[PDB]
């Protein structure tokens, strides 16, 4: 059997695509055969995303594995909910409920607020960015207004790259003017590195400060520079390297060559590529469960236009979504099981702290506890 899917990868996601290839070649079974059509594009441009989605719907794909940015969430979600085409996305979970979007990144607002309450913080700064939406910002603001905190929220997204040092220095001077010893960084692996370099330049990594890296990847960034600074920093970690599955994967991942698999010759692994591996596993398991129950999901090449009127959804889309949401497996990110809305439930986030000898796990946050 041939089950055609589609792949929407951003311009620059090399390690993610390498992990996708590793998962495709590793999880292949005999019940079917995935034939993904890859289409690298710019996810932040809604026009290119619409063009790629229509191009891949013109082939009659079954699902579409792809990323999206805050400027393209609505296009992807609306097209998927209207045309009845699933969408496995390792990006941030959309705000609210959205059918036919099988999100893969576990939530962080709960664990973030739990860590804030654990450290018993009352006044702190919160440097955020509008890349992954403004859900965490609103959650933090509401929790602070309910628990009477002093949050100093600052958008560091408009920092231009030509004179970033001056703006960062002025920002940290203004933060010191209010005596802000606690800072929560909510950025990706690049803005976090930039802010860390600026902190080191301005000399604030000395003992007496505390930072919280608000992202599922702690060891992804450059931590060998703040480790010996004196200040204690904490963060979250979805993919732990102490498990047996992650260890067996890394033992066969660091040995790969960077020429064939770009970004593979490394000991660590970004959590987005781990979610990509798990997404390949989840699609394979869903197709196996559909083929085991003898569900004839074979659709002819009558896909036709992409923006037809009226947009008629095929009768097998809801079946594929139901089979994809009812998949419970164990992967690199941990236990994978989705609720009715597609969001991830029953996960586990390993909270880490950067000691002088390295990051050490101090506990695990869940949703039931």
């Amino acid at each position: 059997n041939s089950i055609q899917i589609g792949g929407l990868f951003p311009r620059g996601a090399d390690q993610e695509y390498s992990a996708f290839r590793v998962g495709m070649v590793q999880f292949s079974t005999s019940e079917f055969r995935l034939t993904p059509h890859i289409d690298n594009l710019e996810v932040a441009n809604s026009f290119a995303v619409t063009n790629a989605f229509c191009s891949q719907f013109s082939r009659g794909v079954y699902a579409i594995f792809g990323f999206y940015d805050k400027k393209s969430v609505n296009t992807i979600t609306s097209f998927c909910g209207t045309l009845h085409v699933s969408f496995i996305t390792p990006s941030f979970p959309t705000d609210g409920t959205h059918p036919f979007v099988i999100q893969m990144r576990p939530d962080l607002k709960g664990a973030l607020l739990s860590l804030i309450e654990y450290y018993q913080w009352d006044k702190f700064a919160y440097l955020y960015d509008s890349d992954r939406g403004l859900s965490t910002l609103q959650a933090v603001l509401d929790s602070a207004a309910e628990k009477k905190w002093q949050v100093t929220a600052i958008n560091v997204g408009n920092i231009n790259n030509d004179k970033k040092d001056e703006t960062y220095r002025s920002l940290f001077q203004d933060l010191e003017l209010k005596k802000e010893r606690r800072v929560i960084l909510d950025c990706e692996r690049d803005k976090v590195n930039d802010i860390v370099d600026q902190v080191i330049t301005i000399g604030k990594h000395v003992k007496g400060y505390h930072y919280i890296i608000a992202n599922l990847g702690f060891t992804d960034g450059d931590l060998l520079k703040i480790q010996f600074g004196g200040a204690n920093v904490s963060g979250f970690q979805i993919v732990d390297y102490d498990d047996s599955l992650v260890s067996k994967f890394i033992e066969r991942w660091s040995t790969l060559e960077e020429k064939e698999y770009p970004g593979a010759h490394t000991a660590t692994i970004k959590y987005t590529s781990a979610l990509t591996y798990d997404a390949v596993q989840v699609m394979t398991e869903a197709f196996r469960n559909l083929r085991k129950q003898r569900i004839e999901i074979s659709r002819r090449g009558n896909a036709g236009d992409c923006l037809a009127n009226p947009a008629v959804p095929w009768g097998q889309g809801v079946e594929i979504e139901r089979a994809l949401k009812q998949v419970q497996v164990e992967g690199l990110s941990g236990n994978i099981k989705f609720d009715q809305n597609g969001k991830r439930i029953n996960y586990t986030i390993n909270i880490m702290e950067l000691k002088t000898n390295g990051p050490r796990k101090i506990g695990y946050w869940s949703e039931v506890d």
């Epitope: 290839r21 070649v25 590793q26 999880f27 292949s28 079974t29 005999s30 055969r33 034939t35 082939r59």
Partner: antibody
Framework: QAQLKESGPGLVAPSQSLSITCTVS????????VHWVRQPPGKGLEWLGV???????NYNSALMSRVSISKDNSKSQVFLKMNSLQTDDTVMYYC?????????????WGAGTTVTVSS | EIQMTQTTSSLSASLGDRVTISCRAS??????LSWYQQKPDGTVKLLIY???RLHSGVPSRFSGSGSGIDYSLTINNLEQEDFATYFC?????????FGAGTKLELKR
């Protein structure tokens, strides 16, 4: 560098079984799958079967009653045991390792050993 | 089974020329074709994957094109090493069928 060295008997009695082996060096037989092809004299190769990395094997609808691939991940080997090898069934049997880079390609292909089942 | 059948059975052209071997499939292979090269000694190797892109480390002279059923691989400037058989496979469904291909020879 991943390489499959197809080592076979080279000759066998008529209507008798024929067992060849392939020892993939550099590629773990549990992570990447193997696929066997048969090229006749001066003709295009025909895929006989494949033993996926998960352990499940899928064979061609023609040689299904004859071909049977069995993998040993510990010894890192894949053996093809085709019984009732006829004189016309004597062709160059080769083994390759599939990959995935924007399409399902067979990257590393073994040199293959000639087999002429004749009494 | 998608029976990928090559167009020309055999071709002959001297060095310094550009040849183009074409193949056609039964059903739509969805541009998931691959052109490989088989030498006389038995050594096979990949030349063009996904019917559009050449493999890693292949000679830049050889290229591919053609979407749908028909797909053609064209050599830019022939040479002595380019004189070998060229086969085509369609990895869109099982059993993966390969084409007999044509062997380019040196015109004398």
């Amino acid at each position: 560098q991943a390489q499959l060295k197809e080592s076979g008997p080279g000759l066998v009695a008529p209507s008798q079984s024929l067992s060849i082996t392939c020892t993939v060096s550099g590629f773990s037989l549990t992570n990447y799958g193997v696929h066997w092809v048969r090229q006749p004299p001066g003709k295009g190769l025909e895929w006989l079967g494949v033993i996926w990395a998960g352990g499940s094997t899928n064979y061609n609808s023609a040689l299904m009653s004859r071909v049977s691939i069995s993998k040993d991940n510990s010894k890192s080997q894949v053996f093809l045991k085709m019984n009732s090898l006829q004189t016309d069934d004597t062709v160059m049997y080769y083994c390759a390792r599939e990959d995935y880079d924007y399409d399902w390609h067979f990257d590393v292909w073994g040199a293959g050993t000639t087999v002429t089942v004749s009494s | 089974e998608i029976q990928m059948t090559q167009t020309t059975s055999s071709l002959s052209a001297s060095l310094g020329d550009r040849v183009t071997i074409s193949c056609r499939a039964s059903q739509d292979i969805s541009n998931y074709l691959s052109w490989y090269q088989q030498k006389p000694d038995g050594t096979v190797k990949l030349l063009i994957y996904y019917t559009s892109r050449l493999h890693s480390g292949v000679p830049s002279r050889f290229s591919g094109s053609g979407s749908g059923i028909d797909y053609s691989l064209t050599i830019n400037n022939l040479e002595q090493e380019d004189f070998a058989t060229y086969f085509c496979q369609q990895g869109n469904t099982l059993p993966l069928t390969f084409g007999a291909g044509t062997k380019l020879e040196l015109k004398r």
